[PDB]
């Protein structure tokens, strides 16, 4: 369960875009307007079982731009429904 680097494609951007949907649903970084997800996004596996290759879901770090903020958000996503969630929503972050 290392983290790797993925691209900041469509996948990626969308990502970024639950993260700053919730955060605008948390009321707690204020009416945010996603802008794009920049490099570096990370993703990490999370395994069922410690040993075993089943798949439980991952996490992604993101750093998102909204309102002209750079934020660094954590996703989970669930493997069997790609149920995400917003883990952590932080910023504004320095520049990656």
């Given at each position: 369960?290392?983290?790797?680097?993925?691209?900041?494609?469509?996948?990626?951007?969308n990502?970024?875009?639950?993260?700053?949907?919730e955060?605008?649903?948390?009321?707690?970084?204020?009416?945010?307007?996603?802008?794009?997800?920049?490099?570096?996004?990370?993703?990490?596996?999370?395994?069922?079982?410690?040993?075993?290759?089943?798949?439980?879901?991952?996490?992604?770090?993101?750093?998102?731009?909204?309102?002209?903020?750079?934020?660094?958000?954590?996703?989970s996503?669930?493997?069997?429904?790609?149920?995400?969630?917003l883990?952590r929503?932080?910023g504004?972050?320095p520049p990656?």
């Open positions: 369960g290392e983290w790797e680097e993925i691209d900041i494609g469509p996948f990626t951007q990502l970024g875009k639950f993260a700053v949907d955060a605008n649903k948390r009321g707690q970084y204020g009416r945010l307007t996603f802008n794009k997800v920049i490099r570096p996004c990370m993703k990490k596996t999370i395994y069922e079982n410690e040993g075993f290759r089943e798949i439980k879901g991952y996490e992604y770090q993101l750093y998102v731009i909204a309102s002209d903020k750079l934020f660094r958000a954590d996703i996503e669930d493997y069997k429904t790609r149920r995400r969630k883990l929503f932080e504004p972050v990656p």
